[PDB]
Amino acid sequence: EEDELAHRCSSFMAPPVTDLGELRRRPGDMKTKMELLILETQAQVCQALAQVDGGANFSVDRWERKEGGGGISCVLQDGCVFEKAGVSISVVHGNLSEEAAKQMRSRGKVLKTKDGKLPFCAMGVSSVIHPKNPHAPTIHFNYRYFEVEEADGNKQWWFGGGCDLTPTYLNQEDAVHFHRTLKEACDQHGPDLYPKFKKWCDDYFFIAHRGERRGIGGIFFDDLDSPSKEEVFRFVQSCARAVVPSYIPLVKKHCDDSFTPQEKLWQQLRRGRYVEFNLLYDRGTKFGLFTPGSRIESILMSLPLTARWEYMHSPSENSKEAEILEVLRHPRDWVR
Amino acid sequence: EEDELAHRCSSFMAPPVTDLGELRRRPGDMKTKMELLILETQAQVCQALAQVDGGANFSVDRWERKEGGGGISCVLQDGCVFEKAGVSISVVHGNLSEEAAKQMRSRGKVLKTKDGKLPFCAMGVSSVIHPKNPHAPTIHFNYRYFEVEEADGNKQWWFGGGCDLTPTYLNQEDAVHFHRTLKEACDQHGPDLYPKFKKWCDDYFFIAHRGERRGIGGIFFDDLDSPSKEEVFRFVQSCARAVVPSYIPLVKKHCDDSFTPQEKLWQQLRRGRYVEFNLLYDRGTKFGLFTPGSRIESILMSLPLTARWEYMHSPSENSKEAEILEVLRHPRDWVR
């Protein structure tokens, strides 16, 4: 019979960033469990996307750097269903830079150095998928884990993540399906998680000057460090496993929908909004792998194939354009 | 005979931000001279653009806010020559916020409060113009002035500005024309200004991760506070007056050039680079009206009508695509 770990690894997009000998020695370490989870998630998502899109192949770049860890970047471009799809993982080990350390103190985190250093590990998966068809929505997700070794055998750790949808026009069934899938995943771990993280997602992706959100939300969480490491991992695992069922059915349903040049135009304006969230409010932080805010590499991976920016006459009062603008300004409940 | 100031004002896009009664009382104040210069420049540029583009009209929005000063924003969109053109002016009076003050100290500026306050005035013009034709280049320019009243009758003041070109493909004649026009303007005020500011421009618009500049540069200067206020103003005035001759001839020459769908595609990728400079390296600073870095309003005004982002096969070794990439990576002299 095939070795359990070997079997898992044959299904990944590329070999793990961490030496397989190390993962084999420490199967129960959260760093091991989380690296395998992010690799699994990346593979599950890429496989689902590749099954849907016959028009392009993933390029898979497993990379490493001396100071910047390693990762696996999977990119699909200009396919028949997806104009852009990126699914990346990163794993970084090292000692925290004085700058990184300083920033955490500003957010109220107190780190006690071990020797003179702060050994740490940060890892995560992050993805942005932009369909070609105006009626097939964009998705973003990310799931990550951080630990830092302090004085004594004490460790400080936390998880972060989220999954959010950016439709061109509102589709009620799609919105409910997406949110319901996320809520079911969260509810397994406690009834207050989805409502909290749904609200957090509505608040976080706010393009402030327009008074509009990027999309229809989903879930967002950060600094998640209770009740226990294993319990939070199981929650994150449920969330990561919800991505494909939350999303691929929407793309399969809508990828062939007819659309007008005007609907395509509107899609392009909505894609410009997606980009603008970064331009104005999330331009790049070097420490983005373990705090809210994106690293440059992530921002680049998120860009669509094309976008449009143009000052727009208020749309007809009962138009689909007006409807989506209203919900971006005033988010709604989708599941209770 | 028409009143000199009234005659000047009839040529502006809208009335000055500052009460005309105040400008009339203090004709010799640098705030007056600079406000008139920025209004003149805005009008000269808009008039030149409107003469070239019969396909769209400028919308002119003269606005004010209680805490945020006032301005005049002129916008043209989706014309027959320009896909986007923005020419804005802002004039803000008030007392420096503790945050703004703090930032200046970080840059090594030392301000001595008058009473408990730092009364200040900041003003400027800023513009981004994106032609439709791949062969007609994008331009950006800005010219600004800041003063703050300190303890005693002492004032701290400085100017900043620049003018830079972002071609889709390199055209040697265009590059020389543009740079020559700027150099002639600078040289009138001293022989070391153009070489210094040309290099500064090459260094500033560096999209670091690609190792490429946004375009072919021009001039860039900041914190310009010597030799005297009148001398620096006259220099800035020469630079502002060089915009139209540096640029409009290039648009008139190339706006009708034939282009291929591939050249249009490349233009779209170059426009994506333009946007990416903000996304990564210049995302927004609230204090951008008096320091390097753009305010959100400026970033928005700069966005093109459309852009593209796509990971690209290295172009043919002697292609025009390869040539522009090489010069973006390794800037050249254009005039000596």
Distant-in-sequence, close-in-space partners of A300: CB < 8 Å, separation ≥ 6: B276, B280, B309
What is the number of alpha carbons within 13 Å of residue A237 lying toward its C-beta? 15
Compute the CA torsion angle B271, B276, B279, B281 (nearest 10 deg): -130
Question: Any binding-site annotation on B294?
Answer: yes
Beta bridge mates, B213:
B206
What resolution in angstroms does the PDB record give? 1.6
B86 CA: distance to closest CA in chain A (Å)? 12
Selecting from A77, A276, A279 the residue whose C-beta is nearest the C-beta of B311 gives: A77
Tokens of B298: 């400026």
Question: Any binding-site annotation on B238?
Answer: no
CATH of the domain at B158: 3.40.1500.10
Number of CB pairs, chain A paired with chain B, less than 8 A apart:
75
Q: Give the position of tokens 């996320």.
A: A182
Are the C-beta atoms of B5 and B203 separated by less than 8 Å? no
Closest C-alpha among A278, A154, A288 to residue A225: A154
Are the C-beta atoms of A76 and A58 separated by less than 8 Å? yes
Residue B61 backbone phi and psi in degrees, to 5: -115, 100
Write out chain B residues lying below 8 Å of A75, CB-based.
Answer: 311
- What is the spatial distance between Cα A48 and Cα A25, in angstroms, rounded to a whole number? 31
Write out chain B residues lying below 8 Å of A84, CB-based.
Answer: 309
Selecting from A77, A209, A307 the residue whose C-beta is nearest the C-beta of B310 gives: A77
Say whether B101 sits in a helix, a strand or coil: helix
Distant-in-sequence, close-in-space partners of B76: CB < 8 Å, separation ≥ 6: B49, B50, B53, B56, B57, B58, B59, B82, B84, B85, B86
Say whether A287 sits in a helix, a strand or coil: coil
Question: Any binding-site annotation on B293?
Answer: yes
- What is the spatial distance between Cα B120 and Cα B278, in angstroms, rounded to a whole number? 27
Q: How many domains does chain A have?
A: 1
Strands (E), chain A: 59-65, 69-77, 82-95, 119-131, 138-149, 155-166, 206-207, 212-213, 217-224, 306-308
Q: What Cα–Cα distance (Å) separates residue B188 from each residue in B45, B212, B239?
A: 22, 31, 10
Strands (E), chain B: 59-65, 69-77, 82-95, 119-131, 138-149, 155-166, 206-207, 212-213, 217-224, 306-308
Domain that holds residue B60: 1-336
Beta bridge mates, B90:
B71, B124
Q: Flag if A306 and B268 touch (Cβ within 8 Å).
A: yes
Nearest residue of B to residue A272, measured between CA atoms: B306
A272 CA: distance to closest CA in chain B (Å)? 9
Radius of gyration of chain B (CA): 20
Method: X-ray
Q: Flag if A284 and B280 touch (Cβ within 8 Å).
A: yes
Q: Flag if A280 and B283 touch (Cβ within 8 Å).
A: yes
Q: Flag if B296 and A283 touch (Cβ within 8 Å).
A: no
- What is the spatial distance between Cα A136 and Cα A130, in angstroms, rounded to a whole number? 8
Q: b vs e for B281-292, b when ≥16 Cβ sit within 10 Å of the residue's Cβ?
A: bbbbbebbbbbb
Q: Which residues of A are catalytic?
A: 140
